[PDB]
Coordinates of C-alpha atoms (C1' of nucleotides) in Angstrom, one line a residue:
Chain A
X15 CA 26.7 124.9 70.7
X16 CA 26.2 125.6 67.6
X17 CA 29.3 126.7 65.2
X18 CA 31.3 128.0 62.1
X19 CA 32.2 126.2 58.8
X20 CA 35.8 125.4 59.1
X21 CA 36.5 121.7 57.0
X22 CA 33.9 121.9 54.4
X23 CA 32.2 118.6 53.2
X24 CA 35.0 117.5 50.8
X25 CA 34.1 115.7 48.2
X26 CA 36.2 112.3 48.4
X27 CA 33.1 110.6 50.3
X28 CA 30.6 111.5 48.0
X29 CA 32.8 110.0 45.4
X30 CA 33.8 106.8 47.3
X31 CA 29.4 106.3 47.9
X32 CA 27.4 104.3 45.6
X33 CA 25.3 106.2 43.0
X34 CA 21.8 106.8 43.6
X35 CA 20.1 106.7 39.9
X36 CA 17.7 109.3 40.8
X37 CA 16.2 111.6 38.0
X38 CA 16.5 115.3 39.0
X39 CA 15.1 117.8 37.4
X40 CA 17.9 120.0 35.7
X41 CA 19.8 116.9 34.5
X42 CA 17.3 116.2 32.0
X43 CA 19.1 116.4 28.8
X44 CA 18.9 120.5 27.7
X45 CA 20.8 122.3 25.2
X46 CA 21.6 119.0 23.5
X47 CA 23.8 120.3 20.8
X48 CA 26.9 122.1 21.6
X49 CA 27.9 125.1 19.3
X50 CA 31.5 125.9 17.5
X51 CA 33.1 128.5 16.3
X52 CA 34.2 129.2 12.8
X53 CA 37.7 127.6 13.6
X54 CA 15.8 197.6 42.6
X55 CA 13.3 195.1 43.7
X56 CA 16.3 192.5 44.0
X57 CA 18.7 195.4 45.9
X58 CA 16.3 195.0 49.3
X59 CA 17.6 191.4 50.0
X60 CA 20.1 190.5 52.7
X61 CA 22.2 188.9 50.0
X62 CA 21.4 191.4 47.2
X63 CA 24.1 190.7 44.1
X64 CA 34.4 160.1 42.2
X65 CA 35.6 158.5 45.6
X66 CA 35.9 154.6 46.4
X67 CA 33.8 155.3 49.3
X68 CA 29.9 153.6 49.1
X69 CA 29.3 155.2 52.7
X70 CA 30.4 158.8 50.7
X71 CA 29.1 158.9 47.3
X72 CA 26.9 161.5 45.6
X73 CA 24.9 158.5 44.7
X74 CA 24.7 157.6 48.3
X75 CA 24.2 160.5 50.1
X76 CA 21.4 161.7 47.8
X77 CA 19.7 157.8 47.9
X78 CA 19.8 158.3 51.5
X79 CA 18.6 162.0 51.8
X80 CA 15.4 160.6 49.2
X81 CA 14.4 157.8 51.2
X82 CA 14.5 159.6 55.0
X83 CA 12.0 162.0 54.3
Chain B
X12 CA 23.5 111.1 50.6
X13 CA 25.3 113.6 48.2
X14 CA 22.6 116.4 49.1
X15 CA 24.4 119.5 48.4
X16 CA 21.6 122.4 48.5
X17 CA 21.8 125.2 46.3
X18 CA 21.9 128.9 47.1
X19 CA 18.6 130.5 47.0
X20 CA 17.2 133.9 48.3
X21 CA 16.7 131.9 52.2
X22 CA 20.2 130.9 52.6
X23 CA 22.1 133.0 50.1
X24 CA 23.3 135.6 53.3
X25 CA 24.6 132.0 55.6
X26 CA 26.4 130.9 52.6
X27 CA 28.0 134.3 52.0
X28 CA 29.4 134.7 55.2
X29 CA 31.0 131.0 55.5
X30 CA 32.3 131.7 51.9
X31 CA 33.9 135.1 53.6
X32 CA 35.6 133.8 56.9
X33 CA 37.0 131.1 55.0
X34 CA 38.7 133.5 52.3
X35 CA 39.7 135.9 55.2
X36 CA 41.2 133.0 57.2
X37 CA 42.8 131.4 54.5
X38 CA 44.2 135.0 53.4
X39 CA 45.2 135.2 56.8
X40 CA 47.2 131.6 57.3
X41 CA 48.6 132.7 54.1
X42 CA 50.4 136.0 55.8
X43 CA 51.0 134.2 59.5
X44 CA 54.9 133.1 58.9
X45 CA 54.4 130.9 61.6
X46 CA 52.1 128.3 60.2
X47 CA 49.3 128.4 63.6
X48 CA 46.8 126.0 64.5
X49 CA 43.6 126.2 63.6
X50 CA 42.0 127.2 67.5
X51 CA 44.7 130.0 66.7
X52 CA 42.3 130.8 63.7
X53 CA 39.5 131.1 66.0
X54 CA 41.0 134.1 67.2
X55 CA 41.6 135.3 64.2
X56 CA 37.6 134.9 63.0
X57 CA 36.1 136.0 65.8
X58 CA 38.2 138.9 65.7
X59 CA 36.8 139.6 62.0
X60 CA 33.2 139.3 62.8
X61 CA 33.8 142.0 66.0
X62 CA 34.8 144.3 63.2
X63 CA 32.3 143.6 61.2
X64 CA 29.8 144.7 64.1
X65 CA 31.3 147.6 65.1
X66 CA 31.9 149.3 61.2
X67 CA 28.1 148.5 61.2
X68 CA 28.0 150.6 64.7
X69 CA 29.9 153.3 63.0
X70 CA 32.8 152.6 65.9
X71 CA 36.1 152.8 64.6
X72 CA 38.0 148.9 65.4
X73 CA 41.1 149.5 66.7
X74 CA 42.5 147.1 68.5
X75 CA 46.2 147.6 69.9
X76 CA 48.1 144.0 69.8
X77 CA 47.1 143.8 66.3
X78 CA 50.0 143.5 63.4
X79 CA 49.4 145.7 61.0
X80 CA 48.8 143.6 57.7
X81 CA 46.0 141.7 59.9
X82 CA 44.5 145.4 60.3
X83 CA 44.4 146.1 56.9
X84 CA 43.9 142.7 55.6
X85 CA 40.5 142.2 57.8
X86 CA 39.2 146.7 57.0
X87 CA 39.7 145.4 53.4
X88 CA 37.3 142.6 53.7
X89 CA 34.9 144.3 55.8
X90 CA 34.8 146.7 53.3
X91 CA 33.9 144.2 50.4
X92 CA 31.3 142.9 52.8
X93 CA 30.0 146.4 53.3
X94 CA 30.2 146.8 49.8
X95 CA 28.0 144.1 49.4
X96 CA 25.9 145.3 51.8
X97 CA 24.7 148.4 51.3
X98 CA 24.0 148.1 47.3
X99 CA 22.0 145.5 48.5
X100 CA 20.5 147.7 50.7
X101 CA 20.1 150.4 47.4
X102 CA 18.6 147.2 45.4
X103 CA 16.2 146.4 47.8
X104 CA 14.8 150.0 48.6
X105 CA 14.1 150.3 44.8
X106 CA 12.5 146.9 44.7
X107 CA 10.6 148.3 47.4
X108 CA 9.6 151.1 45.7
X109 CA 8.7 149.1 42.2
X110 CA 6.2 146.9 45.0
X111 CA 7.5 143.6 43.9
X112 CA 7.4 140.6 45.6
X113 CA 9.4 140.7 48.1
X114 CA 9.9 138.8 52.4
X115 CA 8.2 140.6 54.8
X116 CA 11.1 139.6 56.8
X117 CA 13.1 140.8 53.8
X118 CA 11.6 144.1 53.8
X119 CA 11.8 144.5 57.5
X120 CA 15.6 143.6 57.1
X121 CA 16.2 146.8 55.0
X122 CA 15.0 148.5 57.2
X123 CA 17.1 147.7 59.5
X124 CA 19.9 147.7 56.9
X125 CA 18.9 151.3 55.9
X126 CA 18.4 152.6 59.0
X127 CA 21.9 151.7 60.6
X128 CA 23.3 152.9 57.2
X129 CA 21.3 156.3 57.8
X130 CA 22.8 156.9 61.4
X131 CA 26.2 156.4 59.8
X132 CA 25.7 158.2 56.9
X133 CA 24.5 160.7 60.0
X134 CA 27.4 160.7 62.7
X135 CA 29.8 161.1 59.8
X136 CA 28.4 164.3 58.8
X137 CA 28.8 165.2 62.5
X138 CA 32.0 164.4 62.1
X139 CA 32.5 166.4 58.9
X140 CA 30.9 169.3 60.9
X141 CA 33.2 169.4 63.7
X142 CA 36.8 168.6 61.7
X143 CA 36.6 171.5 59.3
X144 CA 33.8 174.2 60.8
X145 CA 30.4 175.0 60.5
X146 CA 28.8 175.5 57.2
X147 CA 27.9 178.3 58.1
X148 CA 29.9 181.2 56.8
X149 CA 30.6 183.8 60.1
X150 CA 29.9 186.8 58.0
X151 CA 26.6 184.8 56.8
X152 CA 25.3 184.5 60.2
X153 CA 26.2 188.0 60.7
X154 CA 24.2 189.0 57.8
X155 CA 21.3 186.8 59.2
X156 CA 21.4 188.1 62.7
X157 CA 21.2 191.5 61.3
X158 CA 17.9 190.5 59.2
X159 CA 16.0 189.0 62.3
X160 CA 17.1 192.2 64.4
X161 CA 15.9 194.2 62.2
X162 CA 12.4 192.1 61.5
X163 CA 11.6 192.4 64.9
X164 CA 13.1 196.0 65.5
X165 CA 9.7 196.4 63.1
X166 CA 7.4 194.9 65.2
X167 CA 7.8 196.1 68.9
X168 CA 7.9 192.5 69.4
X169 CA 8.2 192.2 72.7
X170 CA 10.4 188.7 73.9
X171 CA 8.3 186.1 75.7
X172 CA 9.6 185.8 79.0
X173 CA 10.7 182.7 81.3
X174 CA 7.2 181.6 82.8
X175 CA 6.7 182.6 86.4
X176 CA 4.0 181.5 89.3
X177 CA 1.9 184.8 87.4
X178 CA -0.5 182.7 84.8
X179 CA -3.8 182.3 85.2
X180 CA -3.5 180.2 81.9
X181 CA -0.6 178.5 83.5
X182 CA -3.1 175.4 84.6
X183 CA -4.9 175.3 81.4
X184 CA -1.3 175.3 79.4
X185 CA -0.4 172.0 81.3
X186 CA -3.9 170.8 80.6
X187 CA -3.3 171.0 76.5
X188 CA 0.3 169.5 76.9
X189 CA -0.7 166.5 79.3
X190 CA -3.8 166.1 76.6
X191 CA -1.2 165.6 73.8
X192 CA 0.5 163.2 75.6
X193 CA -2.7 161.3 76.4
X194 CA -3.7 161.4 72.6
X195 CA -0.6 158.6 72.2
X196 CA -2.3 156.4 74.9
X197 CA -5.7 156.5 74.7
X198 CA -5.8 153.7 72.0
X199 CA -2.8 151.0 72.9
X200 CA -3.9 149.1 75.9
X201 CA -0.7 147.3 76.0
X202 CA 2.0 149.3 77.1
X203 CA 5.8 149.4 77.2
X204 CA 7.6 150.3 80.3
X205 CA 9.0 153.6 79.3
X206 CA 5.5 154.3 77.9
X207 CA 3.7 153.1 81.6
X208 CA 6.3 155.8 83.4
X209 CA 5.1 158.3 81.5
X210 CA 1.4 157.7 81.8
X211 CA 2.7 157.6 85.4
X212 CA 3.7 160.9 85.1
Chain C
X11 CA 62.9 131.0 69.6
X12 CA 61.7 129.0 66.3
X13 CA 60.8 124.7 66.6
X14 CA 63.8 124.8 64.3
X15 CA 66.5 125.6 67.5
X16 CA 63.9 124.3 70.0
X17 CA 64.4 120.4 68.2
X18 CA 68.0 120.7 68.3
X19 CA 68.1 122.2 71.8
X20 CA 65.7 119.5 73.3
X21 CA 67.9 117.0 71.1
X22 CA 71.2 118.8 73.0
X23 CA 69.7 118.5 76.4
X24 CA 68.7 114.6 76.1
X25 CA 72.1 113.5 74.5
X26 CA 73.2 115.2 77.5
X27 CA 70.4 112.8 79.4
X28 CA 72.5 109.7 77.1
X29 CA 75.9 111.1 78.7
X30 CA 75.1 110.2 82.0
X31 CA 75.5 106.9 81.4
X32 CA 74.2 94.2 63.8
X33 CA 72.3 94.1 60.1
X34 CA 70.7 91.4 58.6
X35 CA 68.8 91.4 55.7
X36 CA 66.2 88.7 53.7
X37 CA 66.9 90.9 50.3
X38 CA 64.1 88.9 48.7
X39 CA 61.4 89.7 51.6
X40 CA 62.6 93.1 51.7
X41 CA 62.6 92.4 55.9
X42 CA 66.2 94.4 57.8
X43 CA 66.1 92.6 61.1
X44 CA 68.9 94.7 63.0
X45 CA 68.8 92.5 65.9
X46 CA 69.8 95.0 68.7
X47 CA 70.6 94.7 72.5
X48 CA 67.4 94.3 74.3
X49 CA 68.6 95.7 77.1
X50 CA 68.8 98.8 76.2
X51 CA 65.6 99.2 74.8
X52 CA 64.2 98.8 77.6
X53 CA 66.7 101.7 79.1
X54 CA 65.3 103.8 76.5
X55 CA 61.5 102.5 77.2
X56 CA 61.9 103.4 81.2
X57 CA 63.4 106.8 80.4
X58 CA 61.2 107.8 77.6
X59 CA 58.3 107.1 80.2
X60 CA 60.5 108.7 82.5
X61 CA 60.8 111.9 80.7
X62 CA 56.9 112.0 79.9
X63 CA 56.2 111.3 83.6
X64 CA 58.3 114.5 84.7
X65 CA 56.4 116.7 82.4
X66 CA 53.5 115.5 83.3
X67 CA 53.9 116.1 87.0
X68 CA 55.1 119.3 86.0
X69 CA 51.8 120.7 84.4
X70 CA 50.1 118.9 87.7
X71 CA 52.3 121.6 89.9
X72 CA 51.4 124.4 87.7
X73 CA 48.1 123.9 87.1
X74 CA 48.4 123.7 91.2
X75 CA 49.4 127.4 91.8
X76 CA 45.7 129.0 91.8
X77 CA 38.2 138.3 87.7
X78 CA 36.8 135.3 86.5
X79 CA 33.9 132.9 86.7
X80 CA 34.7 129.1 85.8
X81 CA 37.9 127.4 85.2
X82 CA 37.9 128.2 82.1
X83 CA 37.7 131.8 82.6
X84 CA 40.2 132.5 85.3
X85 CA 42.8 131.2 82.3
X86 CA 41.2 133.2 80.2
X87 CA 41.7 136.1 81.7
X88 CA 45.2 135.1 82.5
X89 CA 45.5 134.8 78.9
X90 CA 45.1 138.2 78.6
X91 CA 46.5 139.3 81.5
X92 CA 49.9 137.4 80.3
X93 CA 49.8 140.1 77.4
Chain D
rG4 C1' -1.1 121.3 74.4
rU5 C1' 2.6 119.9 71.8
rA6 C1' 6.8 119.0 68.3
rU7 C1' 10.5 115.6 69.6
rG8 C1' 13.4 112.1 72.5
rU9 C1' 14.1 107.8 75.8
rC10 C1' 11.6 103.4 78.0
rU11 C1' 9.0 98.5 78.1
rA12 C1' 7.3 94.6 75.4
rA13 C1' 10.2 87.0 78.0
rA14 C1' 12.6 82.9 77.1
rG15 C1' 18.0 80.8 79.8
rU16 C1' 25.1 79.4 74.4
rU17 C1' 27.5 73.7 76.9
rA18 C1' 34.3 77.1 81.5
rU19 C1' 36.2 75.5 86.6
rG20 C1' 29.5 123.5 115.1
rC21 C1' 25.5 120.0 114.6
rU22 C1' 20.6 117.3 115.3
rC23 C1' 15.9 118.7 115.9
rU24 C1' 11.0 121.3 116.0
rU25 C1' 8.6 124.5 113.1
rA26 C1' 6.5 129.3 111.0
rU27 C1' 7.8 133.2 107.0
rU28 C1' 10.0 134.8 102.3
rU29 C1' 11.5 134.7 97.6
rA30 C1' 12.3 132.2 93.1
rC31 C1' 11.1 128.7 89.6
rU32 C1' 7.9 125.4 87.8
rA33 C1' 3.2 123.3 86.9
rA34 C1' -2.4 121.6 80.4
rC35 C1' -3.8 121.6 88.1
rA36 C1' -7.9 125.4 89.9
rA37 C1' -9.3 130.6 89.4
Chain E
rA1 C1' 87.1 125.1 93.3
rC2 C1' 85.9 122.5 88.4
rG3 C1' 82.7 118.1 86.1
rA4 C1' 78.6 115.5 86.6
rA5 C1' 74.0 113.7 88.6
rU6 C1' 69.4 114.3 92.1
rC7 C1' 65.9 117.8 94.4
rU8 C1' 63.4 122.7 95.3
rC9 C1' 62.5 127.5 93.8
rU10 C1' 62.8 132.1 90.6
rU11 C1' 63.4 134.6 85.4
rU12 C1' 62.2 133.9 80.4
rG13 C1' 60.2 130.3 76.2
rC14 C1' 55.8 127.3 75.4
rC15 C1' 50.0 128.8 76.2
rU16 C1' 50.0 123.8 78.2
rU17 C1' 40.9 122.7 79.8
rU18 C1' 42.9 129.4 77.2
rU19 C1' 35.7 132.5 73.6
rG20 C1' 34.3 127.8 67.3
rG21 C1' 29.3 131.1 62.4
rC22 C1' 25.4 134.6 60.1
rU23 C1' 21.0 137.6 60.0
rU24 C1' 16.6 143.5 61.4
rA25 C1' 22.4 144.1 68.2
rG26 C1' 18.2 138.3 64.5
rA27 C1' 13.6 140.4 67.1
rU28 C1' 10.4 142.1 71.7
rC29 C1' 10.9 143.5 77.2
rA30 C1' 5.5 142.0 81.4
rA31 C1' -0.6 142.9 85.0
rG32 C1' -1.7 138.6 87.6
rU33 C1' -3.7 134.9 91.6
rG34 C1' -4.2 130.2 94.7
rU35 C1' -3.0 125.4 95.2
rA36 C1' 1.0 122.1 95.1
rG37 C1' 5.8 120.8 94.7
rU38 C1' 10.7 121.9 94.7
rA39 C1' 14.8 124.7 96.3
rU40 C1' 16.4 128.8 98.9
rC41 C1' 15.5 132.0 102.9
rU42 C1' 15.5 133.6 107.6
rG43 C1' 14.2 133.1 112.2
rU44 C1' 13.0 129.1 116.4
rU45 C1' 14.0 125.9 120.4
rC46 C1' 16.8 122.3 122.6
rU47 C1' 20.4 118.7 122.7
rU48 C1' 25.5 117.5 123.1
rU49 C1' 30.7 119.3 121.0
rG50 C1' 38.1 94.7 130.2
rU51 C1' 43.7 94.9 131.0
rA52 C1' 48.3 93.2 133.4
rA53 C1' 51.2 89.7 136.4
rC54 C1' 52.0 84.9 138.8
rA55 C1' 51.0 79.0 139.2
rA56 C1' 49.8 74.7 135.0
rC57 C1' 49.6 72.4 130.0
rU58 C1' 51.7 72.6 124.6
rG59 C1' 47.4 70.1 121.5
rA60 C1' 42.6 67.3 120.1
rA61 C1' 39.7 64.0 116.9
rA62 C1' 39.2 60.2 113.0
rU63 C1' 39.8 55.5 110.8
rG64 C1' 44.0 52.5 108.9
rA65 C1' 49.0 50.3 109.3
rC66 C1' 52.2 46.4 114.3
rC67 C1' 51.5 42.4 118.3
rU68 C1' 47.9 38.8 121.3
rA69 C1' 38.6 43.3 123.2
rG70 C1' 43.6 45.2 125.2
rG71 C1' 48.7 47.5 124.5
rC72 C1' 52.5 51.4 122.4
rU73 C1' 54.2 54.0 117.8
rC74 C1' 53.0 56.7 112.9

RNA sequence: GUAUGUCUAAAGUUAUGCUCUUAUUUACUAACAA
RNA sequence: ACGAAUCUCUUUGCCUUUUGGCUUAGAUCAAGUGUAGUAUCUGUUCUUUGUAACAACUGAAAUGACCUAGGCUC
């Protein structure tokens, strides 16, 4: 029906068909010139006294935790 | 007749994708010593983008007549994609946030993106839970039990009991809790199903 | 079993089908007419199509022996199943 | 109702178990009516 | 019995019509009628499930080739 890339467009008949002497617009001539280089209060309490993971980083976790509520 | 469109922002995903299956599959014929057809590679693909769907589940993909070095080959590029992915995600949600121009579509798609991401991020802190304990220190809850005890010990608060046929309220209770419902109903006309079985109810 | 050993087998097996039973060349038109007994070729022709014929008739049995839906399915699933 | 897609739009190229009869359902469809 | 050929089957090998992308699982799951068509239903009844032998002939018609309308042959 309808289905994946597998033998891309190569390039051999685009070279083998005539030219089409259209203008485009990026082709117009920019950057001319190339460059070079040179060469007893607080006693009443209860409780008185990196990983290569982008699903688990501190970064991620603490986004995620921001934008939830 | 030499068309060839560029990549913008409508067909930058499409193009990533195509650009992905074809590395995976080349990486792929690269490894398979017996040099398969390409219907063979089908397979392969196909195979790929199941993973792909079920890391986005948050199901592990483990399929048994795998070889290994397929395995790892295809969690590797799932994770690139997932990569890709999710700081997207991050990108967008900030873009979001700045209130720039951005697709209605596109912002709906983060949210979907986010969302699935949250439920993840979620279920694997379930899974954190359960493989190494509660957070919850046993003497801390100890501590805490203690407290409440203690709190109502205070009060004479008497517990509130299981609700038997007694009330003369009990009537007037279903009334304010049938109301609440209501309150969702009243204004949509239009109705889902699970939303009709309730009025229903 | 590789289609190194799988050649040379099938190449055993029809030698063993053969043990049943000139050069001239124009050097300035490049053209090596090795004028050959036409007979033979035709032996080869008859057997070739022979050969073809017999696998070909085999599929048709094998094809002819049978949780599916369509054709299609019922193989696919014994594609699996054969796992 | 449309995109869209087919169609037509005229001149003759020199060879010797069943048939039947009906009534009912359900489904789908319907720029047809309500 | 060994060698070979032909045929059938069984075991394996070959997959021999044997899943061909991506996105927010891409998104959301209904309140209909009569009129017509189409199909599908189900019932419904009945129906029904010239030939041989004997006796006889082996062949017709056309116009033209011989002889003097007639007579045989092709």
């Amino acid at each position: 029906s309808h289905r994946p890339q597998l033998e891309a467009r190569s390039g051999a008949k685009a070279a083998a068909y005539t030219p089409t002497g259209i203008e485009h617009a990026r082709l117009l001539p920019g950057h001319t010139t190339l460059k070079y280089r040179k060469f007893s209060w607080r006693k009443g309490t209860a409780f008185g006294r990196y990983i290569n993971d982008m699903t688990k980083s501190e970064y991620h976790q603490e986004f995620l935790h921001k934008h939830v509520r | 007749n030499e068309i060839v469109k560029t990549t913008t922002k409508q067909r930058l995903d499409a193009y990533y994708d195509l650009e992905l299956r074809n590395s995976v599959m080349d990486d792929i014929l690269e490894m398979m010593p017996e040099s398969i057809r390409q219907k063979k590679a089908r397979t392969i693909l196909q195979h790929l983008s199941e993973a792909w769907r079920c890391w986005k589940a948050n199901i592990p993909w483990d399929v048994p007549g795998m070889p290994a070095p397929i395995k790892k080959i295809i969690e590797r590029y799932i994770k690139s994609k997932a990569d890709a992915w999710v700081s997207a995600a991050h990108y967008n949600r900030e873009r979001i946030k700045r209130g720039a121009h951005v697709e209605k579509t596109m912002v709906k798609k983060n949210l979907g993106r986010l969302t699935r991401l949250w439920i993840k991020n979620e279920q694997e802190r379930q899974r954190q839970i359960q493989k190494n304990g509660p957070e919850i220190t046993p003497e801390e809850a100890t501590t805490i039990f203690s407290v409440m005890v203690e709190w109502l010990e205070s009060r004479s608060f008497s517990p509130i009991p299981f609700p038997p046929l007694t009330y003369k309220n009990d009537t007037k209770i279903l009334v304010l809790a049938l109301e609440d419902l209501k309150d969702v109903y009243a204004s949509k006309v239009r109705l889902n199903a699970s939303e009709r079985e309730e009025l229903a109810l | 079993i590789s289609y190194d050993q799988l050649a040379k087998l099938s190449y055993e097996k029809t030698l063993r089908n053969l043990a049943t039973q000139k050069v001239q060349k124009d050097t300035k038109t490049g053209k090596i007419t090795i004028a050959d007994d036409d007979k033979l070729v035709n032996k080869l022709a008859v057997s070739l199509q022979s050969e073809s014929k017999k696998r070909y008739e085999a599929r048709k049995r094998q094809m002819q022996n049978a949780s599916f839906i369509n054709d299609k399915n019922k193989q696919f699933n014994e594609k699996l199943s054969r796992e």
